[PDB]
Amino acid sequence: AAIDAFTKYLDIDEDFATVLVEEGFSTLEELAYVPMKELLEIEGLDEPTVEALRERAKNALATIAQAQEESLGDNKPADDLLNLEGVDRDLAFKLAARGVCTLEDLAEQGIDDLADIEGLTDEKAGALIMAARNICWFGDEA
Amino acid sequence: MHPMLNIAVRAARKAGNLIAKNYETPDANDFVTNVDKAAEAVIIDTIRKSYPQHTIITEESGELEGTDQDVQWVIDPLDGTTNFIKRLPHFAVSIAVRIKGRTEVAVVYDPMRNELFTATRGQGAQLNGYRLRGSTARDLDGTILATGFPFKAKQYATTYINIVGKLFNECADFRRTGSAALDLAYVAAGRVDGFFEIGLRPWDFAAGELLVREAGGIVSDFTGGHNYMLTGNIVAGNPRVVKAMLANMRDELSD
Amino acid sequence: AMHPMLNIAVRAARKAGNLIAKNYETPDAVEASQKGSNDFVTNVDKAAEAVIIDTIRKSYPQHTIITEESGELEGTDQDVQWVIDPLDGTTNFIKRLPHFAVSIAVRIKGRTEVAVVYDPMRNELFTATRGQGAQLNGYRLRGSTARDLDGTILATGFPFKAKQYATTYINIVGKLFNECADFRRTGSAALDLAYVAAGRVDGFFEIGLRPWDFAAGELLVREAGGIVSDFTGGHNYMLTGNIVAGNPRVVKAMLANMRDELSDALK
Ligand SMILES: [Mg+2]
Ligand SMILES: [Mg+2]
């Protein structure tokens, strides 16, 4: 299961062969060097194509890194969740990671819901949740 | 979450067994309190044998301490006492275990219908092996309100009446079986959409509030604050209906 | 012995209640549809009504039948009526709130003769036959022996179909809360009447009730020492649908208290 990874690896022309799991292509860091005792078993990839393979391999590592750093950011503490007074960038990390990436669903979380938050006690958490209730339920604004 | 819950469940089992046993001496105001004390005492024995370190908090005995003051046992051996006084079978035992200024264990057991709701913070609240998924209502349309008339807080009588009047003008219908703990369990298990009552007490709702919050719901006071623990003013249910209820009920309060 | 038509009625109600319980534990099989105000009606209603009609016609192929759904099925005879509610509190069975009942009563020459209500969740079977009384699973029923509006419990219903009286209704309840202890609200007229006859609640009252939602309970509370009336002391409650019921003292006190708070439309 690697079909999205090797899109452009030996990609001076894609009609040569599919990538080889006989050596694995599944470490991506310890595979930075494999000697020529086993890298003579490839066909249709001459030495300039090998350096192009190295370039596109750096590109593929970049793709995997980008996928990593994009799937990691399932936090997205938004401006509407950052503007909140007493909710800094870091409390917004922890709150948007708690399971509410908004404010309307935030006003629907009690003390024990927003307990165990990094950078907030129990009383000030309750005060902030009550302020969120003012800005979502009590203020009667839309 | 396993041993504390097992101990509490066995305690509620013994309590319900004794309650149902004593429910078969028909008589037509004091012996109800007597069997209340008896169930409370066998509960106390359960507390003393298993974990003699924790402290007990009852409506009757006040608070009886041991050594571990960080683990409070809030045990109401009967909710909606008047029902059992009148043989109307809607009453339950409510066990709660609070740890570090916070409720952690909750059990509500009706022995009549054999309804045994359990609740641990985080992992949620189960019933007989089933998960209580709250209510599906998003507003106060066609919903049911586990409404409670303050028969002990007659000072807020007219205010409460005007509030429930506005509600019934907006909402659909009420229910009141005269049992706060069971009302909270029911609104937790999606059997009734929303709940709200005036002038309650910690030994009453101690378990029901957790049963509700673990069911995708919230518990609050009439002003969205968190002092409902002692102000006795509670509104609960899934957040949609609670918001839809507060938005209508705020503008005719007195506290 | 046991009144014959009462035996047929209780057998039919038993079968209907067993079907009800069967439909209860399956929150999937219920396929309801809204018909009125803030309430559905389910296929289970139709199934239970069918079972009841069939069981009745088995041993009575000519008696007239009355039901909220089928209106009035006029059998070849028209002096023996069977008022049926295969469900009281369909709203509760929607939310699976375990508090409802089936209700079956028989009118002879316009006078209710036998009546039963059945709560399958607690397996309670309120039977009542005229001139012989009311029984709960084999115990007599005398209603609450309370003598005044103090310490009493008042069962009621909110008019979700006629909410106009609500305000008035509210005032009524408000006035009553000045004296009585606590109220009760189960969304089930028949079971409220039963509890009254059971002595579990010491009085019941409702504004605008359906005819086939009390015609079984009213005989229960009658033969259980209690009395029924409208809000003005008359017997027109069968048409107005405005009911008060309970032991004579509490009914008299409630009527005296409500004589003012009430509205002229209801009287
Ligand atoms: Mg108690
Ligand atoms: Mg009906």
XYZ file of C-alpha atoms and ligand atoms in Angstrom:
666
model
C 0.000 0.000 0.000
C 2.228 2.789 -1.311
C 0.439 4.006 -4.460
C 0.405 7.691 -3.447
C 4.111 7.697 -2.494
C 6.060 6.642 -5.597
C 4.235 8.990 -7.964
C 7.478 10.622 -9.179
C 10.466 8.553 -8.014
C 11.969 7.019 -11.175
C 10.011 9.614 -13.136
C 12.134 10.605 -16.089
C 9.556 8.300 -17.694
C 6.938 6.309 -15.798
C 6.691 3.490 -18.378
C 9.728 1.569 -17.109
C 8.524 -0.469 -14.090
C 6.691 -0.173 -10.791
C 8.718 0.353 -7.635
C 10.275 -2.629 -5.913
C 9.193 -3.953 -2.508
C 11.819 -6.707 -2.812
C 14.143 -4.140 -1.207
C 11.132 -2.380 0.281
C 11.042 1.370 -0.411
C 9.448 1.479 3.058
C 12.113 2.940 5.382
C 12.784 6.262 3.606
C 15.580 7.254 5.999
C 17.734 4.141 6.420
C 17.275 3.784 2.638
C 19.334 6.931 1.992
C 22.146 4.594 0.889
C 22.015 1.051 -0.476
C 25.269 -0.109 -2.119
C 25.642 -1.101 -5.753
C 25.811 -4.826 -4.928
C 21.990 -4.864 -5.001
C 21.379 -1.670 -7.024
C 22.616 -3.405 -10.175
C 19.409 -5.489 -10.245
C 17.416 -2.535 -11.644
C 16.977 -2.215 -15.405
C 16.263 0.717 -17.686
C 17.737 3.313 -15.292
C 21.211 4.432 -16.350
C 23.451 6.560 -14.144
C 22.018 10.007 -15.072
C 18.612 8.427 -14.508
C 20.015 7.220 -11.163
C 20.907 10.777 -10.146
C 17.431 11.799 -11.290
C 16.150 8.966 -9.084
C 18.052 10.549 -6.189
C 16.544 13.965 -6.953
C 13.004 12.592 -7.178
C 13.740 10.595 -4.013
C 14.498 13.822 -2.172
C 11.235 15.088 -3.673
C 9.381 11.983 -2.448
C 10.799 12.430 1.049
C 9.555 16.016 0.809
C 6.094 14.740 -0.160
C 5.993 12.331 2.784
C 7.167 15.113 5.107
C 4.465 17.452 3.787
C 1.774 14.800 4.221
C 3.042 14.287 7.776
C 3.021 17.979 8.728
C -0.405 18.453 7.120
C -2.154 15.470 8.715
C -0.594 16.453 12.051
C -2.320 19.835 11.999
C -5.799 18.546 12.783
C -5.880 21.257 15.439
C -6.519 24.497 13.458
C -7.126 26.895 16.367
C -8.871 29.553 14.330
C -8.995 33.309 14.818
C -12.505 32.866 16.211
C -10.861 30.446 18.653
C -7.715 32.585 19.068
C -9.345 36.010 19.498
C -10.984 34.700 22.680
C -9.633 36.667 25.621
C -7.592 34.477 27.932
C -7.311 31.954 25.078
C -3.793 32.466 23.741
C -2.279 30.549 20.832
C -1.334 27.693 23.187
C -4.601 27.361 25.077
C -6.076 27.383 21.567
C -3.799 24.487 20.621
C -5.086 22.520 23.583
C -8.754 23.472 23.173
C -8.980 22.899 19.420
C -7.220 19.592 20.100
C -9.678 18.799 22.909
C -12.326 18.186 20.252
C -13.949 21.560 19.577
C -12.448 23.521 16.678
C -15.029 26.308 17.022
C -16.796 28.455 19.609
C -20.431 27.323 19.375
C -19.423 23.752 20.207
C -17.080 25.256 22.804
C -19.927 26.861 24.754
C -21.257 23.274 24.887
C -18.402 21.924 27.033
C -18.546 21.928 30.820
C -15.831 22.195 33.444
C -15.018 18.488 33.530
C -15.043 18.571 29.726
C -12.385 21.309 29.611
C -10.499 20.000 32.629
C -6.994 18.554 32.174
C -6.281 21.486 29.821
C -2.653 22.596 29.565
C -2.539 26.131 30.949
C -5.842 26.478 32.796
C -7.137 25.688 36.282
C -10.680 24.593 37.125
C -12.118 27.947 38.221
C -10.717 30.090 35.411
C -11.757 27.382 32.942
C -15.301 27.667 34.271
C -15.172 31.450 34.006
C -14.005 31.231 30.393
C -16.720 28.702 29.560
C -19.299 31.035 31.102
C -17.919 33.875 28.980
C -18.267 31.597 25.951
C -21.868 30.992 27.011
C -22.311 34.763 27.086
C -20.893 34.995 23.556
C -22.962 32.072 22.211
C -26.118 31.690 24.332
C -26.749 34.633 26.643
C -25.774 37.598 24.462
C -28.432 36.542 21.926
C -26.309 37.694 18.991
C -25.871 36.195 15.540
C -13.202 2.257 37.184
C -13.902 -1.431 37.633
C -13.535 -1.995 41.411
C -15.156 1.237 42.604
C -18.087 0.671 40.243
C -18.436 -2.970 41.296
C -18.518 -2.014 44.976
C -21.050 0.747 44.329
C -23.198 -1.595 42.236
C -23.229 -4.232 44.973
C -24.162 -1.530 47.487
C -27.045 -0.363 45.303
C -28.044 -4.014 44.874
C -28.312 -4.566 48.621
C -30.118 -1.243 49.037
C -32.663 -2.047 46.340
C -33.202 -5.558 47.673
C -33.960 -4.269 51.169
C -36.139 -1.471 49.779
C -38.238 -3.799 47.633
C -38.505 -6.253 50.525
C -39.826 -3.576 52.876
C -42.116 -2.328 50.087
C -44.509 -5.205 50.916
C -45.776 -4.092 54.312
C -48.864 -2.103 53.279
C -49.916 0.553 55.762
C -52.271 3.528 55.600
C -45.292 8.689 57.769
C -42.449 7.467 59.983
C -41.628 3.883 58.991
C -40.589 5.149 55.562
C -37.849 7.076 57.347
C -37.113 3.925 59.352
C -36.456 1.758 56.302
C -34.611 4.762 54.867
C -32.279 4.685 57.864
C -31.950 0.904 57.534
C -30.944 1.041 53.871
C -28.570 3.897 54.689
C -27.056 1.785 57.467
C -26.468 -1.275 55.304
C -24.963 1.070 52.721
C -22.735 2.399 55.517
C -21.692 -1.173 56.293
C -20.797 -1.670 52.632
C -18.694 1.495 52.870
C -16.976 0.369 56.063
C -16.041 -3.139 54.921
C -14.819 -2.158 51.452
C -12.573 0.929 51.574
C -12.973 2.086 55.208
C -10.840 5.136 54.353
C -13.334 7.136 52.292
C -15.812 9.594 53.789
C -19.606 9.461 53.558
C -21.986 12.325 52.739
C -25.702 11.719 53.290
C -28.752 13.938 53.551
C -29.431 12.149 56.853
C -26.072 11.690 58.592
C -24.581 14.896 57.181
C -20.947 13.924 56.638
C -19.149 11.099 58.455
C -15.401 11.170 57.874
C -12.660 8.567 58.019
C -9.041 9.111 56.992
C -9.217 9.653 53.206
C -11.120 12.928 53.075
C -10.270 13.154 49.357
C -12.856 10.457 48.508
C -16.385 11.518 49.466
C -19.280 9.052 49.274
C -22.508 10.915 48.489
C -25.192 8.267 48.990
C -28.886 9.063 48.922
C -30.565 5.767 49.896
C -33.862 7.131 48.549
C -34.946 9.858 46.145
C -38.546 10.958 45.813
C -39.358 9.604 49.255
C -43.008 10.679 49.043
C -43.550 8.111 46.287
C -42.476 5.237 48.515
C -44.601 6.866 51.209
C -47.561 6.470 48.843
C -46.447 3.113 47.361
C -46.117 4.808 43.968
C -43.191 2.800 42.541
C -40.875 5.489 41.173
C -37.815 5.773 43.405
C -34.159 4.824 43.284
C -30.899 4.797 45.215
C -28.209 7.260 44.130
C -24.568 6.452 44.883
C -21.807 8.910 44.041
C -18.070 8.879 44.711
C -16.291 12.210 44.314
C -12.492 12.291 44.180
C -10.249 15.380 44.180
C -13.027 17.953 44.289
C -14.798 16.216 41.422
C -17.355 13.475 40.888
C -15.925 10.313 39.393
C -18.271 7.398 40.191
C -22.039 7.520 39.772
C -24.765 4.885 40.101
C -28.549 5.220 40.077
C -30.605 2.091 40.715
C -34.364 1.718 40.591
C -35.171 -1.664 42.181
C -38.742 -1.734 40.857
C -37.949 -1.758 37.147
C -34.385 -2.951 37.868
C -32.729 0.029 36.199
C -29.025 0.180 37.043
C -27.258 3.121 35.415
C -23.512 3.419 36.033
C -21.106 6.214 35.138
C -17.351 6.757 35.280
C -15.891 10.089 34.218
C -14.353 9.973 30.761
C -15.302 6.450 29.724
C -18.960 7.404 30.097
C -22.202 6.079 31.507
C -23.624 2.633 30.776
C -26.946 0.947 31.497
C -27.140 -2.850 31.824
C -24.476 -2.973 29.119
C -25.939 -0.195 26.963
C -24.563 3.277 26.288
C -26.873 6.232 26.943
C -26.631 8.470 23.870
C -28.664 11.391 25.215
C -31.485 13.031 23.291
C -31.705 13.882 19.598
C -33.673 17.131 19.899
C -31.966 20.287 18.646
C -34.504 22.779 20.024
C -37.683 22.971 22.127
C -39.952 21.648 19.363
C -42.114 18.726 20.439
C -39.781 18.042 23.349
C -40.492 16.846 26.884
C -39.305 18.608 30.033
C -38.512 16.620 33.182
C -39.997 19.475 35.150
C -39.921 19.670 38.931
C -42.213 21.730 41.133
C -40.380 23.142 44.195
C -42.393 21.600 47.014
C -39.554 22.543 49.394
C -38.717 26.008 47.981
C -42.147 27.649 48.032
C -40.459 31.076 47.966
C -39.761 30.765 44.225
C -43.271 29.409 43.600
C -44.691 32.179 41.414
C -41.408 32.760 39.580
C -41.151 29.059 38.753
C -44.785 29.068 37.639
C -44.221 31.953 35.236
C -41.096 30.217 33.933
C -42.862 26.928 33.250
C -45.709 28.917 31.710
C -43.399 30.539 29.176
C -41.882 27.101 28.598
C -45.162 25.285 27.949
C -46.065 28.146 25.636
C -42.832 27.367 23.793
C -42.169 23.692 24.570
C -44.525 20.728 24.158
C -45.116 18.879 27.434
C -43.751 18.124 30.882
C -43.164 15.049 32.989
C -42.766 14.749 36.745
C -42.495 11.388 38.494
C -41.349 13.010 41.727
C -37.799 11.625 41.706
C -34.950 14.012 40.915
C -32.285 11.323 40.544
C -34.441 9.206 38.249
C -35.447 12.323 36.321
C -31.762 13.003 35.696
C -31.128 9.388 34.720
C -34.045 9.516 32.283
C -33.029 12.780 30.641
C -29.581 11.205 30.424
C -30.877 8.097 28.639
C -32.807 10.102 26.054
C -36.109 9.045 27.597
C -36.976 12.715 28.182
C -35.426 15.528 26.167
C -34.600 18.197 28.733
C -34.618 18.556 32.511
C -34.660 21.436 34.968
C -35.483 21.817 38.651
C -35.277 24.392 41.431
C -33.684 24.143 44.854
C -32.163 20.668 44.647
C -29.388 19.259 46.838
C -26.022 17.582 46.176
C -27.026 14.197 47.581
C -29.920 14.207 45.096
C -28.342 15.036 41.730
C -24.779 13.971 42.604
C -24.942 10.946 40.307
C -27.567 12.149 37.849
C -25.555 15.158 36.727
C -22.679 12.886 35.716
C -25.096 10.428 34.109
C -26.310 13.342 31.998
C -22.953 14.879 31.108
C -21.556 11.509 30.040
C -24.530 11.172 27.654
C -23.464 13.998 25.364
C -25.261 16.454 27.628
C -24.526 19.341 29.966
C -25.621 20.378 33.450
C -25.660 24.018 34.537
C -27.539 26.570 36.614
C -30.171 29.029 35.435
C -27.426 31.529 34.504
C -24.944 29.230 32.762
C -22.675 29.337 35.804
C -21.217 26.414 37.714
C -22.557 27.115 41.219
C -25.571 24.842 40.693
C -23.681 22.414 42.941
C -25.004 24.337 45.955
C -27.562 26.841 44.623
C -29.899 23.917 43.881
C -30.872 25.416 40.509
C -30.205 22.891 37.746
C -30.900 22.683 34.009
C -29.594 19.719 32.042
C -29.772 17.865 28.751
C -27.982 17.787 25.416
C -26.562 21.258 24.751
C -28.979 22.191 21.956
C -32.103 22.018 24.101
C -30.323 23.517 27.106
C -29.358 26.565 25.054
C -32.856 26.774 23.575
C -34.307 26.626 27.095
C -31.976 29.146 28.738
C -32.488 31.636 25.902
C -36.195 31.653 26.776
C -36.019 31.296 30.560
C -33.365 33.906 31.436
C -35.553 36.981 31.087
C -37.995 36.114 33.906
C -35.686 34.947 36.708
C -34.780 36.308 40.131
C -31.408 34.575 40.661
C -66.589 -15.636 39.929
C -65.385 -13.141 37.325
C -67.494 -10.947 35.067
C -67.545 -12.591 31.615
C -67.015 -9.578 29.394
C -64.400 -8.476 31.913
C -62.555 -11.743 31.330
C -62.649 -11.323 27.556
C -61.496 -7.723 27.876
C -58.611 -8.564 30.183
C -57.440 -11.389 27.922
C -57.503 -9.037 24.938
C -55.660 -6.333 26.874
C -53.081 -8.906 27.962
C -52.385 -9.889 24.365
C -52.203 -6.257 23.266
C -49.818 -5.414 26.098
C -47.591 -8.364 25.273
C -47.396 -7.080 21.704
C -46.625 -3.629 23.126
C -43.758 -4.933 25.241
C -42.487 -6.841 22.207
C -42.400 -3.631 20.184
C -40.786 -1.818 23.112
C -37.384 -3.514 23.248
C -36.902 -2.781 19.513
C -36.308 0.956 18.973
C -35.953 0.002 15.302
C -39.314 -1.623 14.547
C -41.282 1.480 15.572
C -42.113 3.445 12.402
C -44.273 6.345 13.547
C -45.826 9.361 11.834
C -47.001 12.669 13.283
C -50.755 13.275 13.399
C -51.455 15.959 16.014
C -49.549 18.448 18.171
C -46.120 17.315 19.406
C -46.994 13.608 19.210
C -46.672 10.762 16.723
C -48.759 7.648 16.158
C -46.942 4.417 15.390
C -47.614 1.275 13.415
C -47.691 -0.402 16.833
C -50.960 1.422 17.485
C -52.449 -0.182 14.376
C -51.079 -3.624 15.251
C -52.423 -3.542 18.806
C -55.787 -2.158 17.706
C -56.016 -4.971 15.155
C -55.179 -7.609 17.761
C -57.772 -6.183 20.151
C -60.503 -5.963 17.515
C -59.833 -9.523 16.386
C -59.781 -10.981 19.899
C -63.033 -9.170 20.672
C -64.798 -10.295 17.500
C -63.699 -13.864 18.258
C -66.051 -14.075 21.240
C -68.242 -11.091 20.281
C -68.788 -10.766 16.526
C -71.476 -8.087 16.882
C -70.435 -5.589 19.572
C -69.837 -1.969 18.640
C -66.245 -0.772 18.930
C -64.834 2.720 19.489
C -61.230 3.786 18.909
C -59.274 6.963 18.208
C -58.181 5.541 14.848
C -61.172 3.571 13.548
C -63.619 6.117 14.971
C -66.747 4.069 15.672
C -67.068 0.614 14.104
C -70.815 0.020 14.395
C -71.381 -3.692 14.833
C -74.723 -5.266 14.042
C -75.692 -4.299 17.596
C -75.308 -0.839 19.088
C -76.049 -1.160 22.816
C -72.773 -2.856 23.823
C -69.811 -0.604 23.066
C -66.114 -1.298 23.586
C -64.113 1.893 24.049
C -60.494 1.032 23.282
C -57.173 2.828 23.482
C -54.392 0.456 22.397
C -52.004 3.062 23.799
C -52.232 5.886 26.325
C -49.120 8.018 26.173
C -47.911 7.236 22.670
C -45.584 10.195 23.192
C -43.854 8.198 25.919
C -43.598 5.027 23.841
C -41.961 7.126 21.123
C -39.200 8.100 23.547
C -39.510 4.590 25.056
C -40.346 6.152 28.414
C -41.517 3.058 30.307
C -44.839 4.494 31.463
C -47.893 3.706 29.339
C -50.843 1.352 29.274
C -53.544 -0.244 27.192
C -57.133 0.599 28.071
C -60.375 -1.265 27.381
C -63.844 -0.561 28.745
C -67.359 -1.731 27.939
C -70.421 0.513 27.844
C -73.886 -0.995 28.266
C -76.831 1.310 27.549
C -74.318 4.140 27.824
C -73.160 3.026 31.282
C -69.615 1.737 31.678
C -69.797 -1.790 33.085
C -66.273 -3.252 32.988
C -62.906 -1.603 32.504
C -59.228 -2.546 32.509
C -55.935 -0.765 32.065
C -52.656 -2.609 31.720
C -49.116 -1.356 32.295
C -46.875 -4.007 30.701
C -43.642 -2.482 31.988
C -44.488 -3.034 35.657
C -46.975 -5.810 34.802
C -49.760 -3.949 36.576
C -53.350 -4.865 35.724
C -56.021 -2.485 37.007
C -59.350 -4.257 36.612
C -62.703 -2.846 37.662
C -66.265 -4.045 37.260
C -69.348 -2.122 38.282
C -70.978 -3.082 41.551
C -67.963 -5.198 42.509
C -65.053 -2.763 42.614
C -61.512 -2.341 41.349
C -58.493 -4.585 41.824
C -54.745 -4.163 41.338
C -53.165 -7.554 40.599
C -55.472 -9.040 43.235
C -55.628 -6.259 45.843
C -58.622 -4.022 46.436
C -58.438 -0.328 45.589
C -59.830 2.364 47.866
C -58.096 5.525 46.682
C -56.223 7.923 48.929
C -58.054 8.404 52.211
C -56.787 11.989 52.382
C -59.382 14.394 53.744
C -58.164 17.810 52.553
C -55.960 19.553 50.004
C -52.976 19.399 52.377
C -50.026 17.115 51.695
C -51.865 15.676 48.719
C -50.359 14.868 45.328
C -52.176 16.088 42.222
C -51.879 14.315 38.887
C -52.555 16.431 35.830
C -51.992 16.819 32.113
C -51.012 19.758 30.029
C -53.296 20.438 27.060
C -50.787 19.888 24.267
C -53.735 19.821 21.839
C -55.596 22.872 23.208
C -52.759 25.040 24.521
C -55.037 28.114 24.551
C -56.258 27.215 28.038
C -52.593 26.922 29.106
C -52.453 30.392 30.655
C -55.720 29.765 32.493
C -54.499 26.235 33.199
C -51.233 27.682 34.507
C -53.103 29.959 36.905
C -55.147 26.968 38.064
C -52.007 24.963 38.787
C -50.485 28.031 40.399
C -53.491 28.438 42.660
C -53.373 24.744 43.498
C -49.681 24.940 44.301
C -50.652 27.353 47.073
C -52.193 24.456 49.011
C -51.298 21.027 47.622
C -47.883 19.466 48.136
C -46.693 18.241 44.739
C -47.948 17.458 41.259
C -47.514 14.496 38.945
C -47.325 14.378 35.167
C -46.925 11.117 33.265
C -48.579 11.908 29.932
C -50.979 8.999 30.393
C -54.567 9.794 31.360
C -55.583 6.188 31.994
C -52.666 5.507 34.322
C -53.325 8.774 36.150
C -56.899 7.669 36.763
C -55.651 4.253 37.861
C -53.129 5.715 40.305
C -55.941 7.849 41.703
C -58.035 4.723 42.148
C -54.867 3.042 43.396
C -54.429 5.616 46.138
C -51.014 6.495 44.742
C -51.952 10.082 43.875
C -54.625 11.823 45.926
C -56.350 13.610 43.049
C -56.275 14.185 39.301
C -57.526 16.862 36.947
C -57.138 17.642 33.256
C -58.481 20.202 30.790
C -59.846 18.826 27.532
C -59.379 15.057 27.567
C -60.460 12.628 24.872
C -63.538 10.454 25.540
C -61.706 7.151 25.045
C -58.886 8.241 27.365
C -60.939 8.109 30.578
C -63.946 5.851 29.902
C -61.947 2.992 31.402
C -60.290 4.880 34.241
C -63.468 6.647 35.302
C -65.104 3.380 36.334
C -61.926 2.476 38.219
C -61.953 5.664 40.274
C -65.709 5.331 40.721
C -65.646 1.828 42.160
C -62.486 2.673 44.131
C -64.276 5.134 46.407
C -63.427 8.163 44.304
C -65.757 10.364 42.297
C -65.396 12.187 38.992
C -66.879 15.425 37.713
C -66.312 18.351 35.398
C -64.823 21.592 36.693
C -68.283 22.897 37.647
C -69.585 19.868 39.542
C -71.713 18.589 36.660
C -71.770 15.367 34.671
C -71.040 16.859 31.240
C -67.369 15.877 31.526
C -67.927 13.143 28.939
C -68.488 15.855 26.311
C -66.286 18.737 27.458
C -63.427 16.358 28.174
C -62.705 18.404 31.306
C -62.093 15.983 34.161
C -61.512 16.111 37.894
C -61.379 12.930 39.934
C -60.461 11.652 43.361
C -61.860 10.951 46.786
C -64.856 13.157 47.633
C -63.071 15.462 50.076
C -60.183 16.366 47.791
C -62.495 16.730 44.796
C -64.739 19.101 46.735
C -61.733 21.106 47.921
C -60.275 21.306 44.412
C -63.594 22.452 42.973
C -63.989 25.083 45.685
C -60.462 26.318 45.003
C -60.878 26.373 41.219
C -64.364 27.938 41.082
C -62.690 31.346 40.663
C -59.445 30.650 38.773
C -61.386 28.836 36.047
C -62.604 30.519 32.866
C -66.183 30.804 31.653
C -65.365 28.909 28.448
C -64.702 25.749 30.461
C -67.726 25.990 32.769
Mg -32.738 11.215 49.905
Mg -54.857 6.507 22.876
